[PDB]
Design a binder for this molecule. Structure first.
Ligand SMILES: C=C(C)CCOP(=O)(O)OP(=O)(O)O
Ligand SMILES: C=C(C)CCOP(=O)(O)OP(=O)(O)O
Lengths: 271, 277, 259, 279
């Protein structure tokens, strides 16, 4: 990935590591620490820091929200990979490694989500006027996006997907719900925390939506080969369009997420 | 006199009406059906009642407490759905009917559980009218802490990762029972007290009271199971007595308040003490 | 009350008949007409007229909208009972009788729905200045209620119902989509065409939404003997709760629809 | 004009982008999936083009017409979805892909089609901006007449109730084509023309133009079949069919004579393309 985005990501990693200090009882915080970092990195989290600085803010104010977003996603990740006994869900061809048993996994996920709200709630700065309102609003966004009409609808509909037999339209919808809403939530939240106004918030949200959707598509093109560059072109266009109107240094970076910048390393390979 | 039986029916009646309105059927239908199957399956609504009584006790009203009151019932509900799963207590029945995963499959029970947990935060955050934003934020943090790894969830995990011990003293069994249940009950009282505009000392008093009934609820639970926990250690001939002490000290904290206002909480305390189901 | 409701169905029937004339070519109009009337009446159309009067307007001002609602309902009724040849829709317990074959029924359903909108667009009286906005508005309401996130959703989800084995929550949901959305539409349109203000429209809209869900909840009562009055009751309460504010025969002439 | 293909392509492209946005996948998913499967499958998008062309012809702009353009294509799409069904044509393919009901079952295909029909009125009704209410209602009226019992559907019924006889005269065959084809093309041009702000005299011209090109299509299709079951060649032979076709084309263009030539150019070329295509 690009230099800017790996560094934001590392910031979030260091913040999460500082907030989740493995202490007694270790059968509790050990699994909580391991699973937070065992989950894949999500741009919905970095997109939060990014959009905040993009609208004037200091990524630092968007930090609690970025951590919470990663945390809501990590709990979801763990639950999705839970070994289930009744075979109520296709055991996703892609099985992952499991350091701890199901009971510990289930439970920790259950403990990870509230933790994201704890960091948020507790990040309120008294010497800040609108803090309680933005933080309140961000908590509504995150809990909606991690909720039944959000991430959960995507996880649920994901189970009906059948190996190269499901349409691109259906998969795009599953990715929009599973990834899109969280990315949208992340851009939206960082805008909010960064002081933005409503029109920007609505465009960064729309951007997040398209980008997240596009990213989920990329992550499934390795499980259902068919990803016509038409879909990608589609989401890519939709995203950049939303981005229009943010001119600047930082704005340059944002658009990079969606569309990679011209690099010699990518031409040197193919040559 | 204080008619505790009538008071509860009315609170429960009011709480059930708000839960049914807050979780409607909508797409995806199966996820919402599952949430509703366990949330509205009937139950005593002790947690939502503790919440509403604490808010009322300090000066506020039901309407302000209702969203949080439903939120603690929602987390309570997902907590049982998750506990009933095969990888946990592996229960087939609950409240007279088949457990959630039996009716819907494990995948949905897990998902619907996660939905109730998220939506509990959405609800309090967005539907609480009658308290400024920073009061609400604070309530969310209080709920987070009480159900986190320093709370309900912590208790549960210290309980499963020690489901084959033998040196369980009164400090190991105090933690589990102070967390895997006390925590959410405790948190219910706090959200209410803060939402009603309680002053710090009042919130401090109710939190302590909260602690006692919290443990009391746990202890009383172990007695209803058997008729490694308190029953085992000192045996009912002091286990039923321990509950008696707790209730007392619980009711002793309530002395901070006018006896007329505290009657409901004194009542909910006794009911937590002398309940059969 | 029985006569007032009865004259309403009659007024709508006499209007449909005046509007759908069997004529050349009979192969088209013969089945258009037969199917417009072989289809049971729906209270959604009744509720539209009663709501227009309720708010002060003349019954004729809502007559085209009510015929449209009947036609959309009629078209859906026809399409839902089509003999499919691949087992993709379980056949109705009381398999209805078909006079014309599947192809004529399919096409005719496609011809009747637009007939509704033709009636509405055609009912604009150029001498009435408020007509275009209200008709337009009502065309949006009906096309939405009969669309993919309204009735078609209920119709679609209904095929998931397994007799004596689907929860009441799920069944009520199907009725809300399949019948509620349309009754909500009929009352909303009726109020709109009568000149009602936003608050009364919303109230009547919500009443109809509840009332139609109850009503459809009753049709199904045969398939699943579990007519739990608690759900039946919960609905009436939410409903009558919406009539409160309108006080008078209002919260009354309407309740007759819940008897 | 120069580059009629280029003009058809840019127009199909705007339409495709607008169709995609109008009908998103959403709950319930099989219903919307099925709608999209046939709506976004490609196609020349002739009806949407006729609609936009007519609007622009009389001075309007594409954006005002776009919802209606999409609407007529929605209708067209659902008529084909219902047409491929086992009770109808019973086709298994369409563009080298399974027909709609082969993919989602007959039930969904019926409903998904009823949803496109419904949504067409909804979209025009709610999304049309830059035209007064009486004008939107009036085009909702036109759309309705062009697809009902005196249009699209009349054409389909009469055709299915005639594939079992032979005494099919010129008059009967023209009813079927005027209705199963021309009707919706007249819908398209009238919708555009009205939204564009056209006078009744202009709407009527465009009305004849459409009626001529729609009949022109079926006639040239018949000619071509014979070249490389009543048809025009069986009823009046290929020679007279070609003469009918030149006359249809000549009459369509006559209708466009008073508009600005540059704005008319697309429609005229469309007419010639219909008259002289090799396939
Ligand atoms: C979380 C534990 C250990 C027990 C449940 O408490 P309750 O006894 O309050 O159960 P319900 O009444 O809600 O059904
Ligand atoms: C003549 C009728 C009634 C339908 C087919 O027309 P088209 O040949 O325009 O097919 P498409 O390109 O739109 O797919």
């Amino acid at each position: 990935m690009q230099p800017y985005w790996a560094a934001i990501e590392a910031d979030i990693e260091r913040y999460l590591k500082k907030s989740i200090t493995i202490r007694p009882p270790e059968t509790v915080f050990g699994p909580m620490h391991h699973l937070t970092f065992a989950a894949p990195a999500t741009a919905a989290s970095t997109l939060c820091l990014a959009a905040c600085e993009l609208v004037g803010g200091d990524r630092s104010q968007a930090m609690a929200a970025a951590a919470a977003i990663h945390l809501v996603h990590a709990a979801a990740y763990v639950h999705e990979h839970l070994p289930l006994t009744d075979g109520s869900r296709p055991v996703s061809k892609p099985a992952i490694q499991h350091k701890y048993g199901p009971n510990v996994e289930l439970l920790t996920g259950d403990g990870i989500v509230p933790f994201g709200f704890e960091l948020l709630a507790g990040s309120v700065d008294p010497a800040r006027t609108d803090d309680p309102d933005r933080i309140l609003r961000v908590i509504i966004e995150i809990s909606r996006a991690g909720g039944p009409e959000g991430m959960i609808s995507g996880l649920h509909r994901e189970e009906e997907i059948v190996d190269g037999n499901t349409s691109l339209d259906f998969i795009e919808y599953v990715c929009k719900k599973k990834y899109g809403e969280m990315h949208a939530c992340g851009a939206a939240c960082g805008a909010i925390l960064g002081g933005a106004a409503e029109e920007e918030i609505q465009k960064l949200r729309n951007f997040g939506l398209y980008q997240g959707t596009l990213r989920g598509m990329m992550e499934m093109k390795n499980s259902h080969q068919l990803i016509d560059e038409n879909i990608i072109g589609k989401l890519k266009e939709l995203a950049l369009e939303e981005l229009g109107g943010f001119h600047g240094k930082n704005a340059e970076l944002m658009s990079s997420l969606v569309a990679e910048p011209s690099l010699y390393a990518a031409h040197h390979h193919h040559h | 006199m204080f008619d505790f039986d009538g008071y509860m029916l009315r609170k429960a009646k009011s709480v059930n009406k708000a839960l049914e309105a807050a979780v409607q059927m909508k797409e995806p239908l199966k996820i919402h059906e599952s949430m509703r199957y366990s949330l509205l399956a009937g139950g005593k609504r002790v947690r939502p009642m503790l919440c509403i009584a604490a808010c009322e006790l300090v000066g506020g009203d039901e309407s302000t407490a209702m969203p949080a009151a439903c939120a603690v019932e929602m987390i309570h509900t997902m907590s049982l759905m998750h506990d009933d799963l095969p990888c946990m207590d592996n229960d087939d029945l609950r409240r007279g009917k088949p457990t959630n995963h039996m009716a819907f499959g494990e995948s949905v029970a897990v998902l619907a559980g996660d939905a109730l947990l998220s939506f509990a935060f959405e609800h309090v955050a967005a539907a609480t009218k009658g308290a400024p934003p920073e009061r609400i934020v604070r309530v969310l943090g209080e709920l987070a802490v009480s159900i986190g790894s320093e709370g309900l969830v912590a208790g549960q995990v210290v309980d499963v990762c020690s489901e084959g011990m033998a040196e369980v003293g009164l400090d190991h069994l105090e933690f589990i029972h102070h967390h895997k249940t006390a925590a959410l009950l405790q948190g219910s009282v706090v959200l209410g007290a803060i939402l009603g505009g309680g002053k710090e000392e009042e919130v401090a008093k109710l939190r302590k009271f909260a602690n006692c009934i919290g443990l009391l609820f746990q202890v009383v639970d172990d007695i209803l199971d058997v008729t490694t926990t308190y029953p085992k250690l000192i045996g009912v001939e002091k286990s039923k007595e321990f509950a008696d002490r707790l209730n007392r000290e619980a009711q002793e904290q309530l002395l901070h308040f006018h006896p007329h206002r505290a009657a409901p909480l004194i009542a909910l305390a006794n009911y937590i003490a002398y309940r059969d189901n």
